[model samples]
Target: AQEVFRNTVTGEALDVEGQAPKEGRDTPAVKQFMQTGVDPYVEVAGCLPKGEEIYLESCSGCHGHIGEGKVGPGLNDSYWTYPKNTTDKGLFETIFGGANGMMGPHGQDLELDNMLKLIAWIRHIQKDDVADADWLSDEQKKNFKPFDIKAWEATGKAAAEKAQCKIS
Candidate 1:
């Protein structure tokens, strides 16, 4: 069964424009998220590197290199332009359907799997305290800490030398 994602503003069913899964992009994680509304990439240590790379390429232009915000609102902080952004599903809907202001739909440009990774990257860069991170599970909260760029970069380098992430 498919999950019905809704618009952040109207709260109506999303009317995605030409949303199609890309060939060879449907990984098991993507399938899991598609079937269950929960993103499997959440707090996945390995995917952070690949996700960060993707963010730098596709999103950094507007959201800033570290999601510190630019023309768009800051993503690293607790503030969300769309309050729905607190949840994975809500963030996905906002990304796929577009939000207010200059944000346009990315559903066509990014496939489902890539979108999940992008979301993962966004979550990784978040600067909120564990208490403020409502999206995290109890287990995740126990291990949660603010984003550290150097630490993440080191992890990325190690993973790259090991031949990239298996999760991605």
Candidate 2:
């Protein structure tokens, strides 16, 4: 049943029996998830505070207080190893599945609602309006690395032009 649903959703020709949908490189869900991880501005009434507090307690040691990099890479930055163009669903899968050096499956430990809150907190940190200095400690602030969007875009454009391809 799950396999049928997976195949239907993905439009793939593979057997999805015990397997799951592989993350497509260019899907909107993957793109958005990679871009922002999750939507932070989603109103969950009183749930925002709980997420913020939880992130501070459990995630900040590695991810930084404002989702900036410390032991882990900055969640707010553009240089995502997973790529910043993935979708919300992809991001959720990554969180639930974990990655090379990250231990996640956070949904296993946290309720779905709480996990959503954490995702929201991460998204909130990514927004430009949220000042990094306000949330991060002094030591964490020292590790701040600014993401150069213009430079990265220009480089990508130049590379694309060399390859005779339109990048955008």
Candidate 3:
């Protein structure tokens, strides 16, 4: 089946523009996500650290070190600049295709697999009511833990401080 990713602004169908995944990195999980609009990488262990590095490098300039928002909208909160951000596919589209304002296309800069990894990191830092996290499977939701702001302030902040984000 052909994968269909839509534009965040025009809501039109988006063309794939990113570099192809590295050899052997195009795992079944990414293929499944392209067809299903559900992210499988979120469940993969050890992806968080990689994803965090990618996020800090590519997104932290505007989105904040921990996604608390800076020049761009706060990613960790329930509030979304584009409501579609609540869904994995929707968020992917915005990242792949440029959205409104300062947002630019990352499709040419990142590999498709890396984009999914970045998505996983973004979802990991989400701060919201567990019931509102529609992306998680029922079983996963059972283990869902809200982003601990206090804990982040204590440890994540210092660790993130040294992480070399665009701003921090």
Candidate 4:
């Protein structure tokens, strides 16, 4: 309900013109967007090569060569906006369903296997290895970041408030 255009790198919510991204010029609340349809113990064996090609053909234009971010957000660093895509399963859902206003659904276009591989490639940009990390603990898994409309509206424009919710 309190949706606004914000920079993925710096949680600043500024207005970007035509062909613009969620522009945020560091006013406050800079956030990154991470996503996944699902996180399986991703093995780069066959997926990496294929996923790289898929990224070039399917992604890349917006995400950049290695998540440096272009039209959209990057994947390399920490801090993400998409709560759903925070986990392995979540990543798959975002790509497959394409939740954000920017991207459309890929559930039908790309095969699920490809999605996993594609996600693995994206992970590689940051994680360095195309490996699965079921590393989340039960407590860690419990933490998810939903938009805090109250905080966003009040100091919302100030700085990204420190996370104080269930998800870590």
Q: Rate the local accuracy (lDDT) of all candidates.
A: 0.76, 0.46, 0.74, 0.48
User: What lDDT does candidate 4 reach at residue 119?
Assistant: 74
Q: What digit string (tens of lDDT, one per residue) describes model 3 on residues 19-136?
A: 4445434666567777778777774435556677889998999999889989998888878878877888888888988798799878767777777778878887887875767677
TM-score for all models, in order of appearance: 0.85, 0.48, 0.81, 0.51
Give each model's clash number.
Answer: 0, 13, 0, 26
For TM-score, candidate 3 versus 4, the one ahead is 3
After TM-score superposition, the amount by which residue 97's alpha carbon in candidate 3 deviates from its true location, in angstroms, is: 0.5
lDDT score for residue 1 of model 2: 11
Worst 10 residues of 3 by lDDT: 159-168
Sort by lDDT, best first.
Answer: 1, 3, 4, 2
Where does candidate 2 have its weakest 10-residue lDDT segment?
A: 1-10
lDDT of 1 by residue, 143-165 (tens): 87788778666674476445544
User: Relative to the unseen true structure, what is the C-alpha lDDT of residue 28 in candidate 3, on a scale of 0 to 100?
Assistant: 69
Model 1 gets an lDDT of 0.76
Model 4, 51-157: lDDT tens digits are: 55778787788877666678888765454567545566556545655655677655556654455557756664553221323424454334423223355347632
Clashing pairs in 3: none
What TM value does model 2 have? 0.48
Q: Using TM-score as the measure, which candidate wins?
A: 1
TM-score: the better of candidates 1 and 2: 1
